[PDB]
Write an enzyme that holds these catalytic residues in place. Sequence first.
Site, PDB file in Angstrom:
ATOM      1  N   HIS A   1       0.847  -1.271  -0.181  1.00  0.00           N
ATOM      2  CA  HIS A   1       0.051  -0.148   0.095  1.00  0.00           C
ATOM      3  C   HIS A   1       0.816   1.139  -0.002  1.00  0.00           C
ATOM      4  O   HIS A   1       1.505   1.650   1.005  1.00  0.00           O
ATOM      5  CB  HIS A   1      -0.889   0.135   1.172  1.00  0.00           C
ATOM      6  CG  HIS A   1      -1.996   0.954   1.028  1.00  0.00           C
ATOM      7  ND1 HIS A   1      -3.216   0.711   1.431  1.00  0.00           N
ATOM      8  CD2 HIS A   1      -1.964   2.513   0.974  1.00  0.00           C
ATOM      9  CE1 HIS A   1      -3.951   1.916   1.136  1.00  0.00           C
ATOM     10  NE2 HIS A   1      -3.259   2.787   1.182  1.00  0.00           N
TER      11      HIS A   1
ATOM     12  N   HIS B   1       1.234   5.056  -2.500  1.00  0.00           N
ATOM     13  CA  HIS B   1       0.680   5.676  -3.743  1.00  0.00           C
ATOM     14  C   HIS B   1       1.876   6.529  -4.581  1.00  0.00           C
ATOM     15  O   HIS B   1       2.513   7.216  -4.101  1.00  0.00           O
ATOM     16  CB  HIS B   1      -0.480   6.825  -3.375  1.00  0.00           C
ATOM     17  CG  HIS B   1      -1.682   6.387  -2.674  1.00  0.00           C
ATOM     18  ND1 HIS B   1      -2.743   6.321  -3.324  1.00  0.00           N
ATOM     19  CD2 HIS B   1      -1.748   5.939  -1.227  1.00  0.00           C
ATOM     20  CE1 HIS B   1      -3.752   5.866  -2.148  1.00  0.00           C
ATOM     21  NE2 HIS B   1      -3.114   5.431  -1.141  1.00  0.00           N
TER      22      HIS B   1
ATOM     23  N   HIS C   1      -9.762   1.140  -0.045  1.00  0.00           N
ATOM     24  CA  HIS C   1      -9.512   1.782   1.080  1.00  0.00           C
ATOM     25  C   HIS C   1     -10.824   1.780   1.921  1.00  0.00           C
ATOM     26  O   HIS C   1     -12.041   2.332   1.416  1.00  0.00           O
ATOM     27  CB  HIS C   1      -9.171   3.502   0.774  1.00  0.00           C
ATOM     28  CG  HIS C   1      -7.884   3.658   0.264  1.00  0.00           C
ATOM     29  ND1 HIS C   1      -7.404   2.804  -0.974  1.00  0.00           N
ATOM     30  CD2 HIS C   1      -7.093   4.366   0.810  1.00  0.00           C
ATOM     31  CE1 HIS C   1      -5.931   3.272  -1.149  1.00  0.00           C
ATOM     32  NE2 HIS C   1      -5.648   4.161   0.028  1.00  0.00           N
TER      33      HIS C   1
ATOM     34  N   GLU D   1     -10.577   3.731   7.455  1.00  0.00           N
ATOM     35  CA  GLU D   1      -9.515   4.430   7.836  1.00  0.00           C
ATOM     36  C   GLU D   1      -9.592   5.400   8.714  1.00  0.00           C
ATOM     37  O   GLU D   1      -8.986   5.508   9.739  1.00  0.00           O
ATOM     38  CB  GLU D   1      -8.925   5.203   6.488  1.00  0.00           C
ATOM     39  CG  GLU D   1      -7.550   5.815   6.444  1.00  0.00           C
ATOM     40  CD  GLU D   1      -7.033   6.506   5.478  1.00  0.00           C
ATOM     41  OE1 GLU D   1      -7.465   6.390   4.214  1.00  0.00           O
ATOM     42  OE2 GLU D   1      -5.878   7.393   5.508  1.00  0.00           O
TER      43      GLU D   1
ATOM     44  N   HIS E   1      -5.939   0.181   5.155  1.00  0.00           N
ATOM     45  CA  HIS E   1      -6.123   0.787   6.394  1.00  0.00           C
ATOM     46  C   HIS E   1      -6.668  -0.352   7.337  1.00  0.00           C
ATOM     47  O   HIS E   1      -6.466  -1.188   7.990  1.00  0.00           O
ATOM     48  CB  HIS E   1      -6.745   2.030   6.361  1.00  0.00           C
ATOM     49  CG  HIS E   1      -5.946   3.034   5.511  1.00  0.00           C
ATOM     50  ND1 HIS E   1      -4.759   3.537   6.082  1.00  0.00           N
ATOM     51  CD2 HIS E   1      -6.062   3.710   4.382  1.00  0.00           C
ATOM     52  CE1 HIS E   1      -4.086   4.483   5.223  1.00  0.00           C
ATOM     53  NE2 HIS E   1      -5.177   4.323   4.124  1.00  0.00           N
TER      54      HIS E   1
ATOM     55  N   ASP F   1       2.241   4.508   2.719  1.00  0.00           N
ATOM     56  CA  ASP F   1       1.150   5.197   1.993  1.00  0.00           C
ATOM     57  C   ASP F   1       1.489   6.274   1.071  1.00  0.00           C
ATOM     58  O   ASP F   1       1.316   6.350  -0.048  1.00  0.00           O
ATOM     59  CB  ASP F   1       0.087   5.505   3.221  1.00  0.00           C
ATOM     60  CG  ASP F   1      -1.303   6.049   2.489  1.00  0.00           C
ATOM     61  OD1 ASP F   1      -1.516   5.745   1.563  1.00  0.00           O
ATOM     62  OD2 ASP F   1      -2.092   6.381   3.361  1.00  0.00           O
TER      63      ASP F   1
HETATM   64 CA   LIG Z   1     -13.130   6.508   7.414  1.00  0.00          CA
HETATM   65 ZN   LIG Z   2      -3.701   4.852   0.861  1.00  0.00          ZN
END
Ligand SMILES: [Ca+2]
Ligand SMILES: [Zn+2]
Length: 349
Positions: A12, A14, A211, A214, A235, A292
């Site tokens: 994970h 980006h 996702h 989170e 997450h 992340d």
């Molecule tokens: Ca959330």
């Molecule tokens: Zn992310």
Amino acid sequence: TPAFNKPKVELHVHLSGAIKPETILYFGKKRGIALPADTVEELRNIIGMDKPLSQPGTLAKWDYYMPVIAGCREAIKRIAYEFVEMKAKEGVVYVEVRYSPHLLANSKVDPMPWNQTEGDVTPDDVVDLVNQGLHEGEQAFGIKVRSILCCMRHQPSWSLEVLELCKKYNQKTVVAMDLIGDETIEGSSLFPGHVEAYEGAVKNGIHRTVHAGEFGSPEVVREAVDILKTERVGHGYHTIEDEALYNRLLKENMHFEVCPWSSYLTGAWDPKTTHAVVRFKNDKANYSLNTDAPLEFKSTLDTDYQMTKKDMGFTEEEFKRLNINAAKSSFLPEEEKKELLERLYREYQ
Ligand SMILES: [Ca+2]
Ligand SMILES: [Zn+2]
Ligand SMILES: [Zn+2]
Ligand SMILES: [Zn+2]
Ligand SMILES: [Zn+2]
């Protein structure tokens, strides 16, 4: 002194959250596009985060530098190439990297992101240029990299297109489809565009991450698992708020993509409470550790391992166990997964 000086697996992260500030500066200057700083330090102070903000305040950093990157063929390939270089320096043997191809395009994207002038780089070109840089990077730096393409919660009208791209570039570098954006949007998981894209993914062997959980909303995690049929959850800290769901996902061996340092800075995890990952560790859950957005979070994979070791009493053998799980939960074809796994076994001997 590194917390875990052994082979790691990252699932994970980006791409657009993992660009070099010097590379942003370079293309800002080359393209005649304005930037609020002209030095690495100042650019880092603006885009980097020292203290917790929030989901929106985090996402807000992208507007500063994405105009410099999106729409430029040379820039798109180079960040992919450089993503591999810097990851190779973090002791990672296998990375999955994710991005929205639409957010790097300046052609055939409605609505146009980043206040861009319409050009000729299509979403299809973006995936092609990223494949090129990741592939060239893999050959140059000796680590294995695959990509994940991202749907956006607020733009279900792009999702079927994200699926088409996943299908065309399957194994040449794309292994999966993601869903990013504001998970507090009512019923965004249920928008027909996302639902059908994820239905088509199952049909086509395109792997699935989402996702969810989170910032809150355990129900969004349930939606990701039962409706979009996701294989991993990005997450997912707030899954523990519904003990019955958390219990079920534990039994089904769901994979949680954990981003500890991120959760602090985005404000997803309240620092006065104990981190969800503590429950995951204690329950011997299936989870990974991940950066992340290392650009915004001024981090490397060691940041997140340092954090768990110091504040949460994580051991050498827990770091080993979770990386094995990350490998088993990776989106590689079976034979490449065995190879990765066998490499981990011998270096953890
Ligand atoms: Ca959330
Ligand atoms: Zn992310
Ligand atoms: Zn200046
Ligand atoms: Zn200055
Ligand atoms: Zn073109």
